[PDB]
Design a protein around this ligand. Sequence first.
Ligand SMILES: CC(C)CCC[C@@H](C)[C@H]1CC[C@H]2[C@@H]3CC=C4C[C@@H](O)CC[C@]4(C)[C@H]3CC[C@]12C
Ligand SMILES: CC(C)CCC[C@@H](C)[C@H]1CC[C@H]2[C@@H]3CC=C4C[C@@H](O)CC[C@]4(C)[C@H]3CC[C@]12C
Ligand SMILES: CC(C)CCC[C@@H](C)[C@H]1CC[C@H]2[C@@H]3CC=C4C[C@@H](O)CC[C@]4(C)[C@H]3CC[C@]12C
Ligand SMILES: Nc1nc(NCCc2ccc(O)cc2)nc2nc(-c3ccco3)nn12
Ligand SMILES: CCCCCCCCC/C=C/CCCCCC(=O)OC[C@@H](O)CO
Ligand SMILES: CCCCCCCCC/C=C/CCCCCC(=O)OC[C@@H](O)CO
Ligand SMILES: CCCCCCCCC/C=C/CCCCCC(=O)OC[C@H](O)CO
Ligand SMILES: CCCCCCCCC/C=C\CCCCCC(=O)OC[C@@H](O)CO
Ligand SMILES: CCCCCCCCC/C=C\CCCCCC(=O)OC[C@@H](O)CO
Ligand SMILES: CCCCCCCCC/C=C\CCCCCC(=O)OC[C@@H](O)CO
Ligand SMILES: CCCCCCCCC/C=C\CCCCCC(=O)OC[C@@H](O)CO
Ligand SMILES: CCCCCCCCC/C=C\CCCCCC(=O)OC[C@@H](O)CO
Ligand code: NA
Length: 390
Amino acid sequence: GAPPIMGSSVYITVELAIAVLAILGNVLVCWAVWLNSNLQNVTNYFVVSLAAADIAVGVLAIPFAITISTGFCAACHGCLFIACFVLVLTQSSIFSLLAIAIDRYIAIRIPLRYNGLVTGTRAKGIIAICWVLSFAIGLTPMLGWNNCGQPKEGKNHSQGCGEGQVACLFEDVVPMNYMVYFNFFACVLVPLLLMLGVYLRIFLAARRQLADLEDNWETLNDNLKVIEKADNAAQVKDALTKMRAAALDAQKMKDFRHGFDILVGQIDDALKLANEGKVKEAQAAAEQLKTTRNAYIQKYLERARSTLQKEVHAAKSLAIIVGLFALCWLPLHIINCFTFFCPDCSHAPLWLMYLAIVLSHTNSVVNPFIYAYRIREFRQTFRKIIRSHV
Ligand SMILES: CC(C)CCC[C@@H](C)[C@H]1CC[C@H]2[C@@H]3CC=C4C[C@@H](O)CC[C@]4(C)[C@H]3CC[C@]12C
Ligand SMILES: CC(C)CCC[C@@H](C)[C@H]1CC[C@H]2[C@@H]3CC=C4C[C@@H](O)CC[C@]4(C)[C@H]3CC[C@]12C
Ligand SMILES: CC(C)CCC[C@@H](C)[C@H]1CC[C@H]2[C@@H]3CC=C4C[C@@H](O)CC[C@]4(C)[C@H]3CC[C@]12C
Ligand SMILES: Nc1nc(NCCc2ccc(O)cc2)nc2nc(-c3ccco3)nn12
Ligand SMILES: CCCCCCCCC/C=C/CCCCCC(=O)OC[C@@H](O)CO
Ligand SMILES: CCCCCCCCC/C=C/CCCCCC(=O)OC[C@@H](O)CO
Ligand SMILES: CCCCCCCCC/C=C/CCCCCC(=O)OC[C@H](O)CO
Ligand SMILES: CCCCCCCCC/C=C\CCCCCC(=O)OC[C@@H](O)CO
Ligand SMILES: CCCCCCCCC/C=C\CCCCCC(=O)OC[C@@H](O)CO
Ligand SMILES: CCCCCCCCC/C=C\CCCCCC(=O)OC[C@@H](O)CO
Ligand SMILES: CCCCCCCCC/C=C\CCCCCC(=O)OC[C@@H](O)CO
Ligand SMILES: CCCCCCCCC/C=C\CCCCCC(=O)OC[C@@H](O)CO
Ligand code: NA
């Protein structure tokens, strides 16, 4: 078998290339938010926390991955920290992603209460607590859920380790039942299934609210034709009461409230001539609603449609970032399951283990590109930053 150093050199060179890109791209995300007040909403504070975690992957997690790949002699508990510190950063990324899903769900479901409920100070508090839980969760093995009490005395005497030390290797010190049940199933897979369900409810809601609009818009228009072609005062009365209720459930910013007070006011005039029995004077009064609909109502339809379509396109960009996290991290998780559940399977080869590790660390590079390709405000700020400074 070849000198371990040769394949070892490839792995290191690759891991360092990844760390450079992780730092640069996510530093540029942070610079952008710092610089552009349009980017300084509550959602993007979570985006920033996510970015700071991806920077820390290049600054610390990747240097740790290189170290533990050597099996150098180390005191067990210090070896656990080198091995698990990435689990803290990964857990903080999940919390951050989960908070974004909820933040956007609160914006689609209750737009009118969003600003008083999701504030910057509350977000700061959430981010501060999620980082505290991430250290707790990601370093649980250090509290005694570890194989430190079972040292591999073959490996440790070969390496020449001393009194208290172990050959520092991930699968030798981190119990695989912590990795599968606690880290994967509970702390990664369940949160990602939640985010899946949140983003589903976001899209149903926007799809619901949209059809409610288009369905309110035809209620307004259809009932016009009823009036136009009626012959007794009563058909008009029945047709008008439907628009009125439709015009207020749509109503459910002083130009918008003047437009609908022109509209309902007209409806309430045609409803009075109808109730009085004047049939033609009610059809002609109800024809004055065309002027209001062309001047005011169509314009709330098109504007209410844009904001909903813009929320959908925005939640789709954020759903992609949750997909890439999963795409990138599931291989390393799925191999742990095989190692743990299939004792009669051969262990996955070394080359695949470090290919799945390298894959997991590339997730720290992709988010900056997603923002740039999918978010105008981020792309335009990236260009200003680059164009000017470099
Ligand atoms: C503030 C940031 C940037 C720097 C953090 C310092 C890091 C690199 C320090 C903090 C604790 C340190 C570890 C603590 C204990 C041990 C056990 C010893 O037998 C080998 C070294 C080892 C494994 C250390 C490696 C370096 C280490 C991980
Ligand atoms: C993107 C995510 C969701 C999909 C990743 C699935 C990958 C990691 C799967 C697909 C096929 C799998 C392999 C299939 C069979 C074996 C042989 C066994 O003796 C060791 C594990 C090993 C080598 C598996 C490891 C995990 C594996 C490589
Ligand atoms: C699709 C993703 C997002 C969720 C499901 C991922 C995990 C939990 C699933 C996907 C495929 C599964 C593996 C498929 C095959 C086997 C071989 C068997 O002898 C032991 C269990 C084991 C190793 C399974 C463990 C759980 C597993 C790794
Ligand atoms: N199973 C595993 N191994 C390693 N590194 C050890 C690679 C190895 C594997 C086998 C061997 O004989 C010698 C070394 N890092 C690992 N990281 C993870 C992981 C991190 C987050 C989720 O899973 N799993 N994981
Ligand atoms: C945040 C600002 C920038 C921080 C930059 C430095 C961060 C630390 C990066 C490196 C960490 C790797 C730790 C290596 C430990 C190696 C070690 O113990 O070597 C000696 C070993 O032989 C003990 O037997
Ligand atoms: C779209 C999903 C694709 C997965 C994500 C990217 C790649 C992740 C890492 C691994 C993927 C598949 C690896 C297949 C080959 C594994 C292999 O060589 O098995 C060796 C086997 O003989 C061990 O006994
Ligand atoms: C998923 C988003 C877009 C990025 C795609 C993933 C790219 C990551 C794949 C990287 C491949 C190079 C792998 C590392 C080189 C070292 C290696 O494979 O094995 C090193 C060993 O010691 C060999 O036994
Ligand atoms: C190893 C540590 C990782 C690197 C640090 C990553 C943080 C990225 C910093 C980018 C933006 C947030 C900090 C704002 C700094 C403001 C500054 O430098 O000048 C002040 C001026 O721009 C204010 O008008
Ligand atoms: C022993 C290794 C070093 C230990 C100390 C490293 C501390 C953890 C490293 C990673 C991330 C630090 C957390 C920073 C979060 C900053 C953040 O996003 O704040 C700004 C955000 O709230 C927007 O307003
Ligand atoms: C700009 C952010 C700062 C990045 C971190 C600066 C310091 C670390 C630089 C990069 C990689 C560390 C590589 C060495 C890790 C392993 C090591 O030193 O020894 C392991 C083993 O051979 C000991 O016997
Ligand atoms: C998806 C939400 C539920 C929790 C997270 C995912 C876990 C369930 C999905 C698939 C598989 C995990 C359950 C164990 C399957 C393997 C098993 O039976 O082990 C075989 C046994 O003979 C080994 O001792
Ligand atoms: C969006 C990402 C999610 C995509 C789906 C992820 C889950 C896919 C799981 C991948 C493979 C499971 C099937 C492989 C079975 C291997 C097997 O039976 O090996 C036989 C054993 O004797 C090897 O020695
Ligand atoms: Na991450």
